[PDB]
Amino acid sequence: RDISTAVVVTTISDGGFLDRLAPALRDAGARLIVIPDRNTGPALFAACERHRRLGLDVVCPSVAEQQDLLERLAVPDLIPYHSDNRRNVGYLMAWMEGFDVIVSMDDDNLPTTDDFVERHQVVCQGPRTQPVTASSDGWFNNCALLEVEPTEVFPRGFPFHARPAHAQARTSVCERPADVRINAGLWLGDPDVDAITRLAVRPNALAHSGGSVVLAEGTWCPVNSQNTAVHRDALPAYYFLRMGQPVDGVPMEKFGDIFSGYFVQVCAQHLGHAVRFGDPVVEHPRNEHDLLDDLHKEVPAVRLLDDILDHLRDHPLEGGDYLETYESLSYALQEIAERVNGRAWSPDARAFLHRSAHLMRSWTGALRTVA
Amino acid sequence: RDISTAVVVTTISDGGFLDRLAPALRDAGARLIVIPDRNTGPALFAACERHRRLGLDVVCPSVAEQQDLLERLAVPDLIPYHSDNRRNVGYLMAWMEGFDVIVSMDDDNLPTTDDFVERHQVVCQGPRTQPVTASSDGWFNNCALLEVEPTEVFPRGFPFHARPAHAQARTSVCERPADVRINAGLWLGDPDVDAITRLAVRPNALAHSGGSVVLAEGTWCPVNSQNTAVHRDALPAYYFLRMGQPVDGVPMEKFGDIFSGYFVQVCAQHLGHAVRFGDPVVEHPRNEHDLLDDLHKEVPAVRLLDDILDHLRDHPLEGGDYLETYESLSYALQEIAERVNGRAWSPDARAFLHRSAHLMRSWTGALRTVA
Amino acid sequence: RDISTAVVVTTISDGGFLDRLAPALRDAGARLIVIPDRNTGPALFAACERHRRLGLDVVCPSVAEQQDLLERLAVPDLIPYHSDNRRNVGYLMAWMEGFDVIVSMDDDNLPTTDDFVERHQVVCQGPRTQPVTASSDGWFNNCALLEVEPTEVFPRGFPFHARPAHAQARTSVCERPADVRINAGLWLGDPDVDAITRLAVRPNALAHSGGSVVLAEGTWCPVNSQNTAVHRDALPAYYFLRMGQPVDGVPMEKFGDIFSGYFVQVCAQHLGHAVRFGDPVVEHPRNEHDLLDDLHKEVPAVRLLDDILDHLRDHPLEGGDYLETYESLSYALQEIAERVNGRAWSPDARAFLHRSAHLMRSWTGALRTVA
Amino acid sequence: RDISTAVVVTTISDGGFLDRLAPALRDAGARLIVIPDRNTGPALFAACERHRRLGLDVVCPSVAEQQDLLERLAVPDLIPYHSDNRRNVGYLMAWMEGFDVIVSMDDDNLPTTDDFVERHQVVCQGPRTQPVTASSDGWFNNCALLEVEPTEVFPRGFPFHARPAHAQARTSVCERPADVRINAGLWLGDPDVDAITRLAVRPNALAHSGGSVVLAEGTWCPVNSQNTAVHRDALPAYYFLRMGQPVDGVPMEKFGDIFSGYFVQVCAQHLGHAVRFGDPVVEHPRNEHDLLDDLHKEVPAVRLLDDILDHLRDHPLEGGDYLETYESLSYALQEIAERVNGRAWSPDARAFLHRSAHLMRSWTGALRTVA
Ligand SMILES: [Mn+2]
Ligand SMILES: [Mn+2]
Ligand SMILES: [Mn+2]
Ligand SMILES: [Mn+2]
């Protein structure tokens, strides 16, 4: 095999999460790329050094080091300096060093099994004839693979127009070729639901009961960046979208991985690749913040997502690899920004897609500069 | 002891709902006050004039008659002309003509029992020793009196900060004196939940199983205007609050009755009166909205309600009747607009309470003009 | 007939302006009340303590002393803590300690004559038959009393709708009884023009040539707080209005004294008092601002002032002194907030008058507490 | 010679302006392309037909005809349907029919001389060695060529950072080769000043006294679309920019020709071509609308223009003709949107350049489809 894996995490904490995260990473010999920020205290740097004494291939480049790498690649203004968007630095660094597997995690996720890194290496098994899951409505609820109380829930980013009729959707499994390049692992405790669902029923994930699935062509499901492995080929299409763009005056937030999860998914299907959902499952403790503020942050993106997802199914792309496909995707978003109709599509909402498309090319242009 | 009842409904439809609503109203000799708007087609007037042929005590004052009435009360600018706020015209007319019971309804509710008016006449039974319900957390979930699928839900306007711990709250019933002047009837089909709950679980209320309760002092529950009887004494405090005020730039909507229900509730309790929940139950069919637009409209008011409800418990009021208590409440809101802190309390959100307090005094000023 | 004068200045600088300002103040034995802010460096306190060694009756209450004072007056939230609105603290202290004349100045004005305090004591001369100036259009351009290059200009706050026809307006002087309680001194160098005029022609006031005038009843002119003496009776109506309220989404700024100057002007005229323009003239050097930012700040208030001034002429007031007249003015503003029409009168702009009216009552409520 | 000229005007009026505009156009045999809108009454169509009886080569394509041409060229959503941006239709139509000179005028401009069309044919004289005007600050005040009362003024779109020092700027004329492709004619009566200047001094253009100038390389001046001739080669770079994009929440307006005037100017200088200012001069009567509303509309663009103009001088372009240069300009604006710094450069302001750049390519892509 001889597979290299790099875990990418951005944080502003003191580094205490490394105590319950390092053992699973250092046992598999995987590299951990911790991306600090301006508002990151010197305790995280000391915590990374201490865990490197204990035998962890951890790196924590200071904001000075990060700005130099982005400066050489002619992208000094691409990544903001007070946001979790800085995880793109860890994406770029792991892609530069040439890792096979890039695992994107948050600083509050804990692996629940010993084979955490091994289960994420499924994106490097290549194309096999394997059971792939299809849905008559083109959507798959990966939260249905879990035991959730008090009621059924959809993951964050799942389109709202498809939820009422999804209970009638036919689900079939067929033995077909598939090349898994993205593996989204599930989460116990507080699942990855949007702020709307969390305020309504406060879901609780008890256990992973549904196993693992591989979605077929035409069946989609939102992919996150808190427990997801991405093959280095698919990483150019995994650019964490920059937030802050106002929709009808209200800036969107906390949806960078919803767009990247769909974008790397659309790009993978154009190249005949698939997305996997299931194991490894992480421990995600419950929240502790302002859920009404989370709602006010997520609504601007939620108002647009259903329209953007519908137009992406009708926009065929081009490209031989992920860089060419992701750029063809950026041009598709600019055409979508002028065709889509709706009350939430004020001039600033349409301009959100146009600036995002430019930032997506600035990301790929920096990757071509590396190569 | 002949009790007179007036039903207030504002609508822009052609008047087809009168075909099914008038039977239960004319069987009790009750008055129906339909309040049309500017865009209300001339077909509603034909339905009202024709349903009066069948014995319905219905009125439908055109916008010319509504504005001539509001001119003489020195309040021409109080009520907007493209909003459901125009139901205040119906409240004013019934209180002018001297009805004992004012039943507020929407144009899509349907009485499910033949005793609809009689069950709403409970707000005239006077004070007597009756079983009253109290709660350790000071909140009562009226939806718990219903059979709701797929999971438990809270009514629209229920404070979000008290929802997680409400399951542990103790509920007791004690024989205590109480005077019911507000009776909020429940609703089958699509229950009155906020847009957050409806997007999440799409609730369906199957039956009324919990019976009727009378809330005690210090126990609150949101009261809407879709199926609520208000005694003529309590009506001055039942002013339907005017929407449209921006909160951090986003205008609020669909919460006029949420503020009115709490305001008439706090005023009733200060005067020794109580609110009742339960019967009569109406049929509110599930109407397919733009639920994302409903969410975008309700979030501005939701961001402030939790703070507003907490301060209204700390602020004692003054007044002998509802007219004096409602004015003291308006001065209390202006004191709250400067006391309160939070991220959602930008200068426009604070000025929303100040403009609302002035409009409430304008509403009571017109009632003092009539009386 | 010993008259006491207090100069009120708020600043965030290091206190270098005291080197040139204190001579004219300590030569007249006048009191200087410097009001620092949170971000005011500790160098200002050394300049005040040291200028008192040279005989200056100066005080500089820290933010701790300012908040302790405002706590006992039940107005802790009245005055923000990062605004020039904190000069209201200086108005409060001088009115508390009982000074006859309160001279409002900025930290960049410089008296050009040795009789600065004496010329400002004109607001204590009492009522006498004196030449008063009237205008056929009801407006007087105080900048016409100055020599301004390169062209004629209007002061900041002058209504725009009356500017084109003001050249045809007739000006007459008549021996009439008048009682001056407000004296607005003029300014050489950079005149007090709005950001619109300054961006256009960059005015430069070379000399004071028109002398002094006393405006008659029905003749108005904006009064600022950069060089204005207010008698202690008129000070309750001189509350520096709080900025920040959004007009159609855009927050207003730099117009607190424009509203205060008109408010104390309308209140003085209802009580039979007059406003004076002319001497003493200060040296206001041209300070290079971000003039585009100044324009963006002043436009919100400018969009409303023309409508507000027109309605304030139609609304008669009540009151025996300034405390009762200023409160009647606040109730008049709430009546105007609903009467007025225009494109710039979105719900947030109307609620700006309602919140301002409450803050004015809070200001007078604290003065009633002191007295 | 054998020169064809097409005058482009968009309007919503009844067509009365054709009475005083047709004689100068029909005498020279020039085509007039009147572009109506949705809110255009049938009187303009009758007025165009009547003037065609009198011998005017006028055309007035209905909104149905306009949408078909844009539909064939795969640009159905490029041009909005309630704006003067529809003059781009007249630009495209005259470019399709192959006119040498395209004269862009407003419906309220009247030629003051008989040689109006002949003086605008100067953009077809080709390159000659002629006196070109240079300025040490790189800016030229074309309003200095007029007699303006009561004081000197700058044209709309002139950068504000350069105005104070422009009085010291050296002006020299040198005999050098120049190919005039854009000729901006001046205007008597109400000049083309921004809303800031018009509210301050209300300028009045008395006569054209300065003659005509041809700006050299590096010397710029804003160009408008109300009295300007554009050679068909330079027309691809004359796309009237679409307004409505919010800057810090405030949408910009009335600045479509300010950006197009600078863009066709920058593109012309890259190709060695020049811009001419002077004759022919038109009659522009005084305004009649809400000048405060004009200010509120123009400020969002004014806050950005000085920054955009500075970066355009430091961004070298590419291209052999105007189509290639205008597209290279669109990519330059996207790089400028991420390099520029300022308080007014909120996320929606930066996204204004990105969407504008996409619309500029959609314009050129439609022109390449025509060819
Ligand atoms: Mn988390
Ligand atoms: Mn309904
Ligand atoms: Mn100053
Ligand atoms: Mn014009």
Author numbering:
A (entry chain C), B (entry chain A), C (entry chain A), D (entry chain C): 4 to 374
Paper text:
Members of glycosyltransferase family 75 (GT75) not only reversibly catalyze the autoglycosylation of a conserved arginine residue with specific NDP-sugars but also exhibit NDP-pyranose mutase activity that reversibly converts specific NDP-pyranose to NDP-furanose. MtdL from deep sea–derived Marinactinospora thermotolerans SCSIO 00652 has been discovered in the antibiotic A201A biosynthetic pathway, generating GDP-L-galactofuranose (L-Galf) from GDP-L-galactopyranose (L-Galp). The MtdL subunit is divided into three regions: the N-terminal region (residues 1–111), the core region (residues 112–291), and the C-terminal region (residues 292–376). The characteristic DXD motif (Asp109-Asp110-Asp111), together with conserved His287, coordinates a Mn2+ ion, which stabilizes the diphosphate of the nucleotide.
